Amino acid sequence: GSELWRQCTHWLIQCRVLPPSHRVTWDGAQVCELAQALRDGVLLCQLLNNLLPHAINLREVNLRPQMSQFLCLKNIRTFLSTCCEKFGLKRSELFEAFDLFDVQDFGKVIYTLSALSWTPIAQNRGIMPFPTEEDIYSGLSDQIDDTEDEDLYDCVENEEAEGDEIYEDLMRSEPKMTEYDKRCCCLREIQQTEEKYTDTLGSIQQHFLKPLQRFLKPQDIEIIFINIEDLLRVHTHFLKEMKEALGTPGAANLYQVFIKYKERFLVYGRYCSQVESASKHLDRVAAAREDVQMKLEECSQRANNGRFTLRDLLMVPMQRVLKYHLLLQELVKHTQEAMEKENLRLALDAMRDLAQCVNEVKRDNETLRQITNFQLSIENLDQSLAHYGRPKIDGELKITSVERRSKMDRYAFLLDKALLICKRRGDSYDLKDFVNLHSFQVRDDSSDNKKWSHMFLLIEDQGAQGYELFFKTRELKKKWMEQFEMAISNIYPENATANGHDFQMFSFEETTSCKACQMLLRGTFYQGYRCHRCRASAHKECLGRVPPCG
Chain centroid to CA 404: 41
Nearer to ligand 9JY, 345 or 363 (CB): 363
Whether residue 493 has a cis bond before it, omega within 30° of 0: no
Task: Pick the closest to residue 243 from 178, 277, 291, 194 (CA basis).
Answer: 194
Residue numbers 11-70 binding ligand 9JY by CB under 6 A: none
Q: Exposed/middle/buried for 64, CB within 10 Å: 0-12, 13-18, 19+?
A: middle
Pattern 326-355, ligand 9JY, x by CB under 6 A? ----------------------------x-
Classify each residue of 352-387 as buried b or exposed e, where b means 16 or more C-beta atoms within 10 Å of its C-beta. eebeebbbbbbbbbebeebbebbeeebeebeeebbe
Residue numbers 489-528 binding Zn ion by CB under 5 A: 501, 514, 516-517
Task: Pick the closest to residue 502 from 461, 448, 546, 465 (CA basis).
Answer: 546
The least CB distance from residue 197 to ligand 9JY, in Å, is: 14
Q: Distance between CA atoms of 144 and 475, rounded to whole angstroms?
A: 10
Specify whether the CB–CB gap between 22 and 155 falls below 8 A: no
Q: Distance between CA atoms of 44 and 194, rounded to whole angstroms?
A: 39
Q: What DSSP element (H or E) covers 365?
A: helix 338-377
The least CB distance from residue 236 to ligand 9JY, in Å, is: 17
Return the range that interacts with Zn ion (CB under 5 A); candidates 4-12, 110-118, 275-283, 532-540. Answer: 532-540
Partner that binds at residue 514, options ligand 9JY, Zn ion, none, CB closer than 5 to 8 Å by kind: Zn ion
Select the residue interacting with ligand 9JY from 520, 531, 538, 543 (CB under 6 A).
Answer: 520
Nearer to ligand 9JY, 86 or 264 (CB): 264
The phi-psi region of residue 145 (left if phi > 0; otherwise alpha if psi is between -120 and 50; otherwise beta) is: beta
Nearer to Zn ion, 252 or 534 (CB): 534
Select the residue interacting with Zn ion from 533, 543, 544, 547 (CB under 5 A).
Answer: 533
Q: Distance between CA atoms of 186 and 189, rounded to whole angstroms?
A: 5
Partner that binds at residue 533, options Zn ion, ligand 9JY, none, CB closer than 5 to 8 Å by kind: Zn ion
Partner that binds at residue 549, options ligand 9JY, Zn ion, none, CB closer than 5 to 8 Å by kind: Zn ion
* Cβ neighbours around 142 below 10 Å, total: 12
The least CB distance from residue 230 to ligand 9JY, in Å, is: 11
Select the residue interacting with Zn ion from 121, 141, 534, 540 (CB under 5 A).
Answer: 534
Specify whether the CB–CB gap between 479 and 67 falls below 8 A: yes
The least CB distance from residue 344 to ligand 9JY, in Å, is: 19
Partner that binds at residue 531, options ligand 9JY, Zn ion, none, CB closer than 5 to 8 Å by kind: Zn ion
Select the residue interacting with Zn ion from 309, 531, 537, 543 (CB under 5 A).
Answer: 531
Terminal C-alpha separation, the chain: 77
Nearer to ligand 9JY, 72 or 275 (CB): 275
Partner that binds at residue 501, options Zn ion, ligand 9JY, none, CB closer than 5 to 8 Å by kind: Zn ion
DSSP 8-state secondary structure symbol assigned to residue 25: T
522 binds ligand 9JY (CB under 6 A): yes
Residue numbers 495-514 binding ligand 9JY by CB under 6 A: 508-512
Nearer to ligand 9JY, 241 or 433 (CB): 241
Select the residue interacting with ligand 9JY from 15, 321, 399, 412 (CB under 6 A).
Answer: 321
The least CB distance from residue 146 to Zn ion, in Å, is: 36
Select the residue interacting with ligand 9JY from 31, 455, 521, 546 (CB under 6 A).
Answer: 521
Nearer to Zn ion, 235 or 539 (CB): 539
The least CB distance from residue 348 to Zn ion, in Å, is: 21
Strands 466-471 vs 454-460: parallel, antiparallel or unpaired: antiparallel
549 binds Zn ion (CB under 5 A): yes
Q: Distance between CA atoms of 447 and 468, rounded to whole angstroms?
A: 13
- For 424-464, the DSSP string reads EETTEEEEEEEEETTSEEEEE-----STT-EEEEEEETTS-
Specify whether the CB–CB gap between 68 and 40 falls below 8 A: no
319 binds ligand 9JY (CB under 6 A): no
The least CB distance from residue 200 to ligand 9JY, in Å, is: 17
- For 64-130, the DSSP string reads --TTBHHHHHHHHHHHHHHHHHTS---TTTSPPHHHHHT-S-HHHHHHHHHHHHTSHHHHTTT---S
Residue numbers 192-231 binding ligand 9JY by CB under 6 A: none
Select the residue interacting with ligand 9JY from 360, 394, 416, 468 (CB under 6 A).
Answer: 360
Q: Distance between CA atoms of 279 and 310, rounded to whole angstroms?
A: 9
Specify whether the CB–CB gap between 325 and 355 falls below 8 A: yes
The least CB distance from residue 362 to ligand 9JY, in Å, is: 9
Return the range that interacts with ligand 9JY (CB under 6 A); candidates 11-19, 144-152, 260-268, 460-468. Answer: 260-268
Nearer to Zn ion, 22 or 515 (CB): 515
Specify whether the CB–CB gap between 82 and 49 falls below 8 A: no
Q: Which residues bind Zn ion (CB under 5 A)?
A: 501, 514, 516-517, 531, 533-534, 536, 539, 542, 549
Q: Which residues bind ligand 9JY (CB under 6 A)?
A: 265-266, 268-270, 272-273, 321, 354, 357-358, 360-361, 508-512, 520-524, 527
